[model samples]
Target: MIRLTIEETNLLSIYNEGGKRGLMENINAALPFMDEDMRELAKRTLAKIAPLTENEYAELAIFAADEVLEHHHHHH
Candidate 1:
């Protein structure tokens, strides 16, 4: 079991929408586009987090957005 910070989880959902592995890479390359803490958290979480099931991970992803990153990078 692994944990995600916030943005990584949310962005992952957006990334997963297309069901493409390369999408994750593409989105990941833009981590610097995020705020510093979030970018770091995303990096840590993405690294520590297990490569996992999409549907299962989606739930955690939702929580990360709703609970953790309720407001970040000017997004809510």
Candidate 2:
């Protein structure tokens, strides 16, 4: 099973609420905060016109774990 950080989990819920559009919007909003590598990955993912696959989502979650969770430091 894939492990997700808090923000990634939130993004999943956003996806559930508004599908790809919501997810993309959130991703775009977070772009400025991401590092170069994460930014590149996000841009690549967003470039796709097709719906994101579960595998892709999982991969994104993993990649975004450190980046998105940088500010939030609550105990898990």
Candidate 3:
């Protein structure tokens, strides 16, 4: 029921490589490395997105690089 922006949804898929909980965990771990605003945006974004199942996660891998590149594009 959470509404993710295109970037957020893409980020969620990319980051969710380890599935929903894994995605959540990694995001938590990666937050400190992200910029201040991104850290906050990601935290808030993750707060709303649901966890993915293993099968669901498997389908999410191929887009990681593309989404990250897109993310960079949107920012600059």
**TM-score: model 1 vs. ground truth:** 0.46
lDDT of 2 by residue, 1-76 (tens): 4444554454344333244566777677777875676666655555552456645554554344345545877586
Off by over 4 Å in 1: 1-23, 68-76
Descending-TM-score candidate ranking: 3, 1, 2
Kindly state the number of residue pairs that clash in model 1.
Answer: 0
As for candidate 3, its clashing pairs are 20-52
Q: Which stretches of candidate 3 lie over 4 Å from their true place?
A: 50-76
For each candidate, what TM-score against the reference?
0.46, 0.41, 0.55
Residue 63 of candidate 3: its Cα lDDT?
Answer: 44
Q: What is the lDDT of candidate 1?
A: 0.54
Per-residue accuracy of model 1 over 1-76 as CA lDDT, tens digit each: 4666565666555445433344456558776675677566555555544465554455554455555443455554
lDDT of candidate 3 over 1-76, digit per residue (tens)? 3345666666665466556778788788887776786677777766654563556545544343464565457553
Better model by TM-score: candidate 2 vs candidate 3: 3
RMSD of each: 4.5, 7.0, 5.2
